[PDB]
CSV table of C-alpha atoms in Angstrom, one decimal:
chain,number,residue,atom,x,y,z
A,158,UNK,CA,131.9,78.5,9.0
A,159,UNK,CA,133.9,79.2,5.9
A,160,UNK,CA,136.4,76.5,6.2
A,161,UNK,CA,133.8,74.4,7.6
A,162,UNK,CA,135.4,73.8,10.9
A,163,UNK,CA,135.8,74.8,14.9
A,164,UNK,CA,131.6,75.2,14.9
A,165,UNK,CA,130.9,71.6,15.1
A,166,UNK,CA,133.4,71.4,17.9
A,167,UNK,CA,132.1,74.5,19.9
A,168,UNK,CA,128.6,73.1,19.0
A,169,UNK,CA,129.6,69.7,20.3
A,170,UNK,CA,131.1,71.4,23.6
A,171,UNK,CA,128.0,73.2,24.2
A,172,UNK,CA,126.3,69.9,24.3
A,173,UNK,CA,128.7,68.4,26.5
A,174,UNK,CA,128.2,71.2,28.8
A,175,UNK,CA,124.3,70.3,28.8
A,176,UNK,CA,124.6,67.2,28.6
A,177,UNK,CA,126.9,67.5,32.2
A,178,UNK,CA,124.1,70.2,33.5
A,179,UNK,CA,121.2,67.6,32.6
A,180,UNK,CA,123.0,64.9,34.1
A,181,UNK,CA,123.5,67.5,37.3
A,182,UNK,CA,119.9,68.0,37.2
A,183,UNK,CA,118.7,63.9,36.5
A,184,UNK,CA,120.8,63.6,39.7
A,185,UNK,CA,118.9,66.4,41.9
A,186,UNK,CA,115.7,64.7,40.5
A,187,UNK,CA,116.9,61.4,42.1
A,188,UNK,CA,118.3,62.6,44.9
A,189,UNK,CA,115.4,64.9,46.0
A,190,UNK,CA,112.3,63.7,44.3
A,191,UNK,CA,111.5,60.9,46.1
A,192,UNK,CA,113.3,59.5,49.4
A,193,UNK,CA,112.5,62.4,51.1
A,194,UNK,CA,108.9,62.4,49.5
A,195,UNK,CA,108.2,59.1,50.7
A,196,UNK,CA,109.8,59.9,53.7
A,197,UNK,CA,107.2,63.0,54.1
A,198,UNK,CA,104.5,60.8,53.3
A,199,UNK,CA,105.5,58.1,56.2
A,200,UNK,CA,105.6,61.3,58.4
A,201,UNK,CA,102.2,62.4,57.0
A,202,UNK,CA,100.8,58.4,57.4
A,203,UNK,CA,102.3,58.0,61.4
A,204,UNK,CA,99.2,58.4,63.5
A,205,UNK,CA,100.6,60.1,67.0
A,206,UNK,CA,97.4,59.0,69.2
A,207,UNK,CA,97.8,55.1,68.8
A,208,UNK,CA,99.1,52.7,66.1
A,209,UNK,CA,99.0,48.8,66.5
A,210,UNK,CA,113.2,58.1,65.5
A,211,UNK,CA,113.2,56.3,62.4
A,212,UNK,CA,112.1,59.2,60.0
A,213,UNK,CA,113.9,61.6,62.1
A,214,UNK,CA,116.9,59.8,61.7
A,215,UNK,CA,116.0,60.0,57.7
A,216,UNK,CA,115.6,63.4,57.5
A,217,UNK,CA,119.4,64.0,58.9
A,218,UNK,CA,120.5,61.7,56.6
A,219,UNK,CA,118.9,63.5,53.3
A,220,UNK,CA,120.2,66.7,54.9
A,221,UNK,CA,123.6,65.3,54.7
A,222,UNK,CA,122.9,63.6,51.5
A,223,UNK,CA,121.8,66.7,49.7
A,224,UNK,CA,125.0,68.7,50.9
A,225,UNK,CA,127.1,65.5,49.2
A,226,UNK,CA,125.4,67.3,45.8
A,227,UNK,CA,127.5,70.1,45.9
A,228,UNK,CA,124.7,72.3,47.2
A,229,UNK,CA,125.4,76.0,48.4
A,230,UNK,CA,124.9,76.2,52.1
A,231,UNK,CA,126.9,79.0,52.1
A,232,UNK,CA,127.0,81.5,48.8
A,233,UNK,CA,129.3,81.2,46.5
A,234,UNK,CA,132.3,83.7,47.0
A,235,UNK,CA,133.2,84.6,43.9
A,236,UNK,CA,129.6,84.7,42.4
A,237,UNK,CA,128.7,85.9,45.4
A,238,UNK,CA,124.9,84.7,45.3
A,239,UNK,CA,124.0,85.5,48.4
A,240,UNK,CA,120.2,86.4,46.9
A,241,UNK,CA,120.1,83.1,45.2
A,242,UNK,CA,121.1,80.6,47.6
A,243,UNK,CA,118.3,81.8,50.4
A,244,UNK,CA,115.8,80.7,47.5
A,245,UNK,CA,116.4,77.4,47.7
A,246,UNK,CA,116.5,78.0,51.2
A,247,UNK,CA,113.2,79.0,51.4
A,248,UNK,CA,111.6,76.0,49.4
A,249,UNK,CA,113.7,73.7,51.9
A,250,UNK,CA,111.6,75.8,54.3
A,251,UNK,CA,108.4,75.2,52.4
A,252,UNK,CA,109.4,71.6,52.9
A,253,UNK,CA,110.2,71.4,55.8
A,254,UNK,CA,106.8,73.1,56.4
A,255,UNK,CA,105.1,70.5,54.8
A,256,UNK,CA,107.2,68.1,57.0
A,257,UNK,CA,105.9,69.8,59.9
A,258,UNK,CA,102.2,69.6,58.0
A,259,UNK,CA,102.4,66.3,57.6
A,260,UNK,CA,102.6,65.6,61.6
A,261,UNK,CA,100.2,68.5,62.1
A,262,UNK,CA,97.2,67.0,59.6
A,263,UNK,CA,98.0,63.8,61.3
A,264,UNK,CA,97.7,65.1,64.5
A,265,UNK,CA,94.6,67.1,63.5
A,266,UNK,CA,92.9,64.3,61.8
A,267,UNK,CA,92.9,62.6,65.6
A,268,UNK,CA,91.8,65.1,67.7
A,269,UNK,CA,88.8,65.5,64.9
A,270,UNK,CA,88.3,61.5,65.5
A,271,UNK,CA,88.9,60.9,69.3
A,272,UNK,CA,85.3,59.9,69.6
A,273,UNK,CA,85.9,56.7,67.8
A,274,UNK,CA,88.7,54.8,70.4
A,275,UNK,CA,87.6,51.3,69.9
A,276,UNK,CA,88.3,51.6,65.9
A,277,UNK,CA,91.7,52.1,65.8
A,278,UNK,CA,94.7,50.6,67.2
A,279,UNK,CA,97.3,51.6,70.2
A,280,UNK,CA,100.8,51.3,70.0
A,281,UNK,CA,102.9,49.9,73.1
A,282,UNK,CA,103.4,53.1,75.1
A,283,UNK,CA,99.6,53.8,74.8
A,284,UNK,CA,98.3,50.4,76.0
A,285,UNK,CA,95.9,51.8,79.0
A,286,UNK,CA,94.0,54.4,76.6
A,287,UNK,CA,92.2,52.4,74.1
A,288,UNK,CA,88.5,52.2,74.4
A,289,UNK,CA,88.8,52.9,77.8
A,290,UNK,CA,86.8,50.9,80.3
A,291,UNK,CA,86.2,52.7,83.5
A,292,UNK,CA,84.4,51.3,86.9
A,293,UNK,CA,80.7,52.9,87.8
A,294,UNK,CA,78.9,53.1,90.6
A,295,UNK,CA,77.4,55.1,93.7
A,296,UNK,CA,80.0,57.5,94.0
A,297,UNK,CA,78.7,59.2,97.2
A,298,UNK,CA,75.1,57.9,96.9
A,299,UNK,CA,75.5,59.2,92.9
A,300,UNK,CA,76.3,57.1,89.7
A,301,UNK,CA,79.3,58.3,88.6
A,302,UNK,CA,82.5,57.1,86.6
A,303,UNK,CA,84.6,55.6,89.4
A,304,UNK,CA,87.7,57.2,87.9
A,305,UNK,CA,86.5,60.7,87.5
A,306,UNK,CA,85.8,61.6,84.1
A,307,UNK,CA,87.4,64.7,83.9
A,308,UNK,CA,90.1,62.4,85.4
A,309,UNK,CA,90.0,60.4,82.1
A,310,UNK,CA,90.4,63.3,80.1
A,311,UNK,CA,93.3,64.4,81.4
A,312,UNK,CA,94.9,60.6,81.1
A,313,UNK,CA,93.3,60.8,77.4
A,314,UNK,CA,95.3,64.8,77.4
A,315,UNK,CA,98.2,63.2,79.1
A,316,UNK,CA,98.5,60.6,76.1
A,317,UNK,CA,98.3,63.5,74.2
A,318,UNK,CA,100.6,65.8,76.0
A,319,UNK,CA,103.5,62.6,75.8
A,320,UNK,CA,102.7,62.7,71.9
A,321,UNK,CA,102.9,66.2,71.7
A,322,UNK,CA,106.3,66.7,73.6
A,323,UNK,CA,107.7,63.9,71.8
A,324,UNK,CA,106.6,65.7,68.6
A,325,UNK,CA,107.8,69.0,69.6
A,326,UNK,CA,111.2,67.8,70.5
A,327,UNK,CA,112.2,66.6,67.1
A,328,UNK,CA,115.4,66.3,65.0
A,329,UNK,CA,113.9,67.3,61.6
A,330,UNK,CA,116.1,68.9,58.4
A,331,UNK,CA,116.1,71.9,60.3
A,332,UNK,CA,116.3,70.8,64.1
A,333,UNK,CA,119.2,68.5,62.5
A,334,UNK,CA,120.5,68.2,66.2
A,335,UNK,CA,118.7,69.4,69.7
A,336,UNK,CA,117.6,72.0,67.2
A,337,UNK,CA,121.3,73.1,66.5
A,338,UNK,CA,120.7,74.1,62.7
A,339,UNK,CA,117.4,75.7,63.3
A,340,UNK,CA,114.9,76.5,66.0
A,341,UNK,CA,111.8,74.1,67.2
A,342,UNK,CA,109.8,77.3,67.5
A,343,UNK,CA,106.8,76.0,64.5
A,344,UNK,CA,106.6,73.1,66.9
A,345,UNK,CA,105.5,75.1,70.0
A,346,UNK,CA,103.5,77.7,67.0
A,347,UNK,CA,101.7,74.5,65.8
A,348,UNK,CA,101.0,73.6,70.2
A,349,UNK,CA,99.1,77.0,70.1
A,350,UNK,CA,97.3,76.7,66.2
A,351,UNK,CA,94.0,75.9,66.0
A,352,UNK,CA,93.9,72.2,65.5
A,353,UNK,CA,95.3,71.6,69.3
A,354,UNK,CA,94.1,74.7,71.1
A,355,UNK,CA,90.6,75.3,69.3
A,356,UNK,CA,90.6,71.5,69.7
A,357,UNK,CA,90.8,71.1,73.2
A,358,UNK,CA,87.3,73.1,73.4
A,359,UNK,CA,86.0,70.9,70.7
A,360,UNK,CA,87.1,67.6,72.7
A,361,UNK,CA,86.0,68.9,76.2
A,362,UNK,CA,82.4,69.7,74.7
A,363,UNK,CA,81.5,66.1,73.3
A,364,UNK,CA,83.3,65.4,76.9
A,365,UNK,CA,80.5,67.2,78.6
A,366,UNK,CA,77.7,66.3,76.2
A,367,UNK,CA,78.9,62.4,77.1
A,368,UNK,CA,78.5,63.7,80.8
A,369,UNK,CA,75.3,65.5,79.1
């Protein structure tokens, strides 16, 4: 500072260096913030049951996208970060986890509102499930359901059984391909949680208090 020179300049690097970094960054906000949020919140929004690829499909694209922002996949060798890069590792995780959360709050939210078939709306694959109509009479000298209720529920559990197969075998950021760059084991975790095991004794009660 004493002939007033060379601190402006290293001052004027620093910034350039920030100025790079901040750029760096405004790109990971881009990049990240948003196309895969939206994409989470289609996943979260796509009712599994009946609605009147393409995400998957996404998610394999933003996978590939992010690595196109110089990410560390693998540590860096002569930094050797091997600490630091599962961090960002394990947030993917948490997001992927919410991925996964998404599909499993959808799919919770309709085996809570099965009761309610004639409100909402089936998709082509699901055309003979909708507020099903089923023939009665004298089955036997006895009123019953002509196709045997417990019959329908398993064609209401086969529904749910395509759904839940077609869930389960999924191409998300981690299953990128057949499950190649990670397992489909939360798929098969989520099958036995709560909101599909527990379920199933919360559907086949209000199915025998409608036989009730």
């Amino acid at each position: 500072t004493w002939t007033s020179m060379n601190i402006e300049s290293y001052l004027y690097y620093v910034h350039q260096g920030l100025k790079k970094l901040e750029q760096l960054i405004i790109n990971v906000n881009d990049i990240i913030e948003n196309r895969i949020e939206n994409n989470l919140k289609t996943v979260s929004k796509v009712v599994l049951v009946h609605l009147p690829n393409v995400e998957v499909e996404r998610a394999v694209d933003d996978l590939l996208q992010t690595i196109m922002l110089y990410p560390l996949d693998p540590h860096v060798d002569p930094v050797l970060p091997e600490e630091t890069k599962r961090i960002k590792r394990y947030y993917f995780w948490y997001f992927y986890q919410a991925l996964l959360n998404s599909t499993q709050n959808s799919l919770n939210a309709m085996k809570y509102r099965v009761c309610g078939k004639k409100i909402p709306g089936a998709n082509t694959l699901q055309n003979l499930k909708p507020f099903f109509q089923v023939e009665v009479q004298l089955n036997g000298d006895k009123v019953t359901l002509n196709p045997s209720l417990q019959e329908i529920q398993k064609s209401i559990n086969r529904a749910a059984t395509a759904v839940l197969r077609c869930s389960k075998h999924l191409y998300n950021w981690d299953q990128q391909n057949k499950d190649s760059t990670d397992k489909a084991t939360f798929y098969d975790m989520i099958a036995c949680d709560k909101e599909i095991v527990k379920v199933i004794l919360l559907l086949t009660g209000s199915i025998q208090g409608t036989k009730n």
